[PDB]
Amino acid sequence: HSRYEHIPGPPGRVLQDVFLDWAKKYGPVVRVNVFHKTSVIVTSPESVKKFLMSTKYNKDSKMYRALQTVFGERLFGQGLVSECNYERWHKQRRVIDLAFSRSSLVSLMETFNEKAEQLVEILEAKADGQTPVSMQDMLTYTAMDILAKAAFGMETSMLLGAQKPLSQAVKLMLEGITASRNKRKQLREVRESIRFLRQVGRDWVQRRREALKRGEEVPADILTQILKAEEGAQDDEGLLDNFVTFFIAGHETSANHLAFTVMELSRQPEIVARLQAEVDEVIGSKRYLDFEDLGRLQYLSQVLKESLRLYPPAWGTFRLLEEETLIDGVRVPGNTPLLFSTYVMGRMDTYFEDPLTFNPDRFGPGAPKPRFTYFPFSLGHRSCIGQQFAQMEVKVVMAKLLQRLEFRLVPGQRFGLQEQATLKPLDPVLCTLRPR
């Protein structure tokens, strides 16, 4: 008699689609196997509210092992995403929060604008209606160049075709996370890629420390606060865990969200005409979007919320259930990982009418707000520290694309998903482009 046997469950697609099928068939508490562990997927809004909105429930560290270390190489270690002890998390969260204040983020608008403008100019030169362009690749290069400058004061210049070894290292590390949760050459390429990313942190931290000593210019950035959180530490391993955490987390989900949005909008010509009209009316001929302009792009804000409902790059989270608890009529044993999924809840007709329809008007003013059914940045104390940074950067990039260019998805390109650390388009989002 297995400890989970009594829980309801089974006797371009991802595992999350299988979980969706099972939540619909077996109800709000279902036993699954994920990251090699038995867990329970909990899909009632009452459960999302109870477990995400209380500091009583902490993240289940077992479900973060493949971010902490891959194939025996330390990756994110005990950085801000993967630290599951409340007190150790809270200390670093409150120091790093200062880099995400309103004043800190408004000062990044110049960087967001400059990299968005550079992308647009590169794309405008290819806008012949014939040359295929990977929007997944171009949006990833743009997100990387933004993050490296905004967070670290470094110029990666991926939009100029630079840092190819770094681009390969990130790709192989993301494949390593995926393989670890589900040979000789794979192990070697993944392990060397993780060590490369930590050595980039060593190199960049040494550059920052030399700049501070020589009395050169250093703007207050995320790296300032990562350093501050480690003041008086025994070694640099905590520093490098947060360096790699922010270097990867600060670009990959943003790129995924951009690529999903461009992909979906390629089959939504009326919505695109509305977004083009909105950018035309709000920013006009301006080459630079001001902070005050972002809040005026209200239809774009709704489109991006709807993109996250259907295509959340980070599908959810886990909490550790410490004691046996009744969850929606089901007895869940103590020491169980509870899986929460914004991907699954977003596709359930219980929670969203016509869930596969892309309808920005779900997020219109005076529309009833989703109540614990929608959480692409999670909820509660472990919600995304980067949520407003991401929302600002992606609005800037999308507004500049919409101002200047028309995109058509190359026929044959698919709308399917893949999972490698995060959810992202299976295909490269190959488009042809024309100037507006």
80 or 127: CB nearest ligand HEM? 80
Most distant CA atoms of the chain, gap in Å: 69
Considering only 123-131, 284-292, 316-324, 424-432, which stretch makes contact with ligand 0I1 by CB under 6 A? 316-324
CA pair distance 253, 250, nearest whole angstrom: 7
Q: Which does 80 bind (CB under 5 to 8 A by kind): ligand 0I1, ligand HEM, none?
A: ligand HEM
> Which candidate, 242, 312, 311, places its Cα nearest to that of 67?
242
Minimum distance, C-beta of residue 342 to ligand HEM, in the bound complex (Å): 7
- Is 198 an interacting residue with respect to ligand HEM (CB under 6 A)? no
Chain positions 350 to 369 lying near ligand HEM, rule: CB under 6 A, are: none
133 or 314: CB nearest ligand 0I1? 314
Considering only 105-113, 161-169, 230-238, 380-388, which stretch makes contact with ligand HEM by CB under 6 A? 380-388
Minimum distance, C-beta of residue 285 to ligand 0I1, in the bound complex (Å): 34
Give the list of residues 6+ apart from residue 29 with CB closer than 8 angstroms, or none: 7, 8, 40, 41, 42, 43, 44, 47, 327, 328, 329, 330, 332
Chain positions 36 to 95 lying near ligand 0I1, rule: CB under 6 A, are: 63-64, 67, 81
Q: Which does 382 bind (CB under 5 to 8 A by kind): ligand 0I1, ligand HEM, none?
A: ligand HEM
9 or 136: CB nearest ligand HEM? 136
90 or 434: CB nearest ligand HEM? 90
- Interface pick for ligand HEM out of 389, 398, 400, 431 (rule CB under 6 A): 389
Residue 170 near residue 248 (C-beta atoms within 8 A): yes
The residue assigned the tokens 């993780």 is 194
Minimum distance, C-beta of residue 68 to ligand 0I1, in the bound complex (Å): 10
- Interface pick for ligand HEM out of 250, 337, 346, 370 (rule CB under 6 A): 250
Give the list of residues 6+ apart from residue 247 with CB closer than 8 angstroms, or none: 147, 148, 151, 152, 197, 200, 201
The residue assigned the tokens 């207050």 is 220
Minimum distance, C-beta of residue 185 to ligand 0I1, in the bound complex (Å): 21
- Is 384 an interacting residue with respect to ligand HEM (CB under 6 A)? yes
Q: Which does 389 bind (CB under 5 to 8 A by kind): ligand HEM, ligand 0I1, none?
A: ligand HEM
Minimum distance, C-beta of residue 384 to ligand 0I1, in the bound complex (Å): 5
- Is 249 an interacting residue with respect to ligand 0I1 (CB under 6 A)? yes
Residue 365 near residue 301 (C-beta atoms within 8 A): no
CA pair distance 223, 198, nearest whole angstrom: 14
* Cα angle: 143, vertex 144, 145; to 5 degrees: 95
- Interface pick for ligand 0I1 out of 194, 248, 289, 409 (rule CB under 6 A): 248
Chain positions 73 to 92 lying near ligand HEM, rule: CB under 6 A, are: 80-81
Query: Looking at beta carbons, which residue is closest to ligand 0I1?
Result: 249
> Which candidate, 224, 180, 258, 198, places its Cα nearest to that of 421?
180
Q: Which two tokens stand for residue 153?
A: 């004061």
Say if residue 431 carries a ligand binding annotation. no
- Is 204 an interacting residue with respect to ligand HEM (CB under 6 A)? no
Strand partners, 408: 432
156 or 253: CB nearest ligand 0I1? 253
- Is 253 an interacting residue with respect to ligand HEM (CB under 6 A)? yes
- Interface pick for ligand HEM out of 229, 314, 345, 423 (rule CB under 6 A): 314
Minimum distance, C-beta of residue 434 to ligand 0I1, in the bound complex (Å): 33
Strand-strand pairing, 69-70 and 430-435: unpaired
- Is 384 an interacting residue with respect to ligand 0I1 (CB under 6 A)? yes
Considering only 85-93, 183-191, 220-228, 244-252, which stretch makes contact with ligand 0I1 by CB under 6 A? 244-252
- Is 9 an interacting residue with respect to ligand HEM (CB under 6 A)? no
- Interface pick for ligand 0I1 out of 318, 363, 374, 375 (rule CB under 6 A): 318
Q: Which residues are annotated as a binding site for heme?
A: 384
Summarize as ranges the residues that interact with ligand HEM (CB under 6 A).
Answer: 80-81, 93, 245-246, 249-250, 253-254, 257, 313-314, 317, 376-378, 382, 384-386, 389-390
